[PDB]
């Protein structure tokens, strides 16, 4: 019941504005029960947090016991939610009270064990990355709380846009699904019918200062890339002109849109309205660079997952390495060399000189990682794929070689 | 608890003109139908759930070029399922399914399942496309023809999709996985 929830939250907000604590609390619960019908644990947990924001650790069931009973239940929700770091953070508050305010060590030991479980899970139980979907409601046909507005929706586990948009169209059967992701004109905005834009957007890692300069393990940093996020990207490729049948990359630019929601996700709802939108354009060069970095980040991340666990199937490793070592179908970075390393490209742009060196570094950077990963593959490859591994090495050797000369060993 | 996600290796074959790469990128990145961004690298992977089972799907983009006839089957071993694709608007690529791809696959992996895929399902109704084909005295492949071809080669499923409209795409990959489970 998105409408009911939106309604409940609209009610709930008003009550906050006009100090009606009794009413506000009644609505928190109404809202919580709704999430539970849907199995939205994490959003249920965040909503209860609105109650405890009102409570305090005092003896005035008194406040401390109530806040305590509440924290327990919330922590329970986050556990189902698999927001272990959120759970841990509530455990610490409780533990402080147990340790320093009421000296309940028995309950404290229980709390610590609960934290040991969450810390362990963070590292050992992989959680599926959720997807974010932007929806725009652009008809004049829409009610005033949806009208010409963009919302970001947090995907359920393994929920894919095809599945989501289907339910959405079900909700509105006269709405037409737009065929552009491009910001609509005022011609559509002031129309009588309902038009719906829907696409997947990319979350942006919010900056946390805990991890600001320290070396944090992928395992615990990746989680923040897709959760606790307030900023999102959509990238679209636009060709500018002088297209080459050989390498599309030279002429490919990206238009990138940014959406900022008013609140982080996850929170009290599965969606928050976009409050700011920005667009920036990235040049084929800048694009090549992101592409190179992603590729190196992935290889490094993979070699690390494999250095750790040895019960990991190798297929996912073969695949990644080979597709980068011997990119038969798509270009390879030769396309990037052919596209930007001409004497001519440099002459036209002198600004990019700082960038070109950066692009060059990634290529030199690639080889070590590749070989590193190849070493692993060698050790643990089933014998029916030995021939396959042997070729992959030859290309790599070949590759190591041409690259080392052109670019110094790194 | 529960071990590791089932890793499924799926190998995609077909002519260069089939545009099989566009299928893999669109599905893996869950891209908008109109716009997807190419990369300079060959393989695509997705973590997906089918029939309540979560798996790590690896999509191998093989090279159609003939130069690779020696090199391409090296990665054939260990495959869980094969995706064979042809353009619905290229009877040549269709004929190559029977002529070259099926034989090659079957030669190398006798018991690995096969899914037949018909690409460019959106062009099969494009007027300009129909006209050019006629001038060459050719017509697009029809549903009944693709199915017969599948039956012939012993493919588990025959499916038609369009990377551009995205319609019928998800199904190809769902079904690829049902074939392995």
UniProtKB/Swiss-Prot annotation, chain A:
One of its GO terms (cellular component) is membrane. Its main location: membrane. Residues 15-410 form the DOCKER domain. GO terms for biological process: actin cytoskeleton organization; alpha-beta T cell proliferation; cell migration; chemotaxis; establishment of T cell polarity; immunological synapse formation; macropinocytosis; membrane raft polarization. GO terms for molecular function: GTPase activator activity; guanyl-nucleotide exchange factor activity; small GTPase binding; T cell receptor binding. It is found in: Endomembrane system; Cytoplasm, Cytoskeleton. Specifically expressed in hematopoietic cells. Highly expressed in peripheral blood leukocytes, and expressed at intermediate level in thymus and spleen. Expressed at very low level in the small intestine and colon. Keywords: Acetylation, Cytoplasm, Cytoskeleton, Disease variant, Guanine-nucleotide releasing factor, Membrane, Phosphoprotein, SH3 domain. The keyword Membrane applies. Belongs to the DOCK family. Involved in cytoskeletal rearrangements required for lymphocyte migration in response of chemokines. Activates RAC1 and RAC2, but not CDC42, by functioning as a guanine nucleotide exchange factor (GEF), which exchanges bound GDP for free GTP. May also participate in IL2 transcriptional activation via the activation of RAC2. The DOCKER domain may mediate the GEF activity. It is linked to Immunodeficiency 40: A form of combined immunodeficiency characterized by lymphopenia, and defective T-cell, B-cell, and NK-cell responses. Patients suffer from severe invasive bacterial and viral infections in early childhood and may die without bone marrow transplantation. Homodimer. Interacts with RAC1 and RAC2. Interacts with CRKL and VAV. Interacts with CD3Z. This is Dedicator of cytokinesis protein 2. It comes from Homo sapiens (Human). The gene is DOCK2.
From Swiss-Prot, chain B:
Changing residue 22 to Y: In MRD48; decreased substrate adhesion-dependent cell spreading; dominant-negative effect; reduced neuronal proliferation. GTP-bound active form is ubiquitinated at Lys-151 by HACE1, leading to its degradation by the proteasome. Belongs to the small GTPase superfamily. Rho family. The modification (Microbial infection) O-AMP-threonine is found at residue 39. The modification Phosphoserine is found at residue 75. The modification (Microbial infection) O-AMP-tyrosine is found at residue 36. This is Ras-related C3 botulinum toxin substrate 1. GO terms for biological process: actin cytoskeleton organization; actin filament organization; actin filament polymerization; anatomical structure arrangement; anatomical structure morphogenesis; angiotensin-activated signaling pathway involved in heart process; auditory receptor cell morphogenesis; cell adhesion. Isoform B is predominantly identified in skin and epithelial tissues from the intestinal tract. Its expression is elevated in colorectal tumors at various stages of neoplastic progression, as compared to their respective adjacent tissues. Changing residue 74 to A: Strongly reduced interaction with PLCB2. GO terms for molecular function: enzyme binding; G protein activity; GTP binding; GTP-dependent protein binding; GTPase activity; protein kinase binding; protein-containing complex binding; Rho GDP-dissociation inhibitor binding. SMART domains: RAB (SM00175), RAS (SM00173), RHO (SM00174). One of its GO terms (cellular component) is recycling endosome membrane. Its main location: membrane. It catalyses: GTP + H2O = GDP + phosphate + H(+). Changing residue 39 to A: Abolishes AMPylation by Vibrio VopS. Plasma membrane-associated small GTPase which cycles between active GTP-bound and inactive GDP-bound states. In its active state, binds to a variety of effector proteins to regulate cellular responses such as secretory processes, phagocytosis of apoptotic cells, epithelial cell polarization, neurons adhesion, migration and differentiation, and growth-factor induced formation of membrane ruffles. Rac1 p21/rho GDI heterodimer is the active component of the cytosolic factor sigma 1, which is involved in stimulation of the NADPH oxidase activity in macrophages. The lineage of its organism: Eukaryota, Metazoa, Chordata, Craniata, Vertebrata. It is found in: Cell membrane; Melanosome; Cytoplasm; Cell projection, Lamellipodium. GTP binds at residues 16-22, 35-36, 38-39, 63-64, 120, 122-123, 162-164. Glycans are attached at residues 36, 39. Changing residue 39 to S: No interaction with PPP5C. Translocates to the plasma membrane; also.
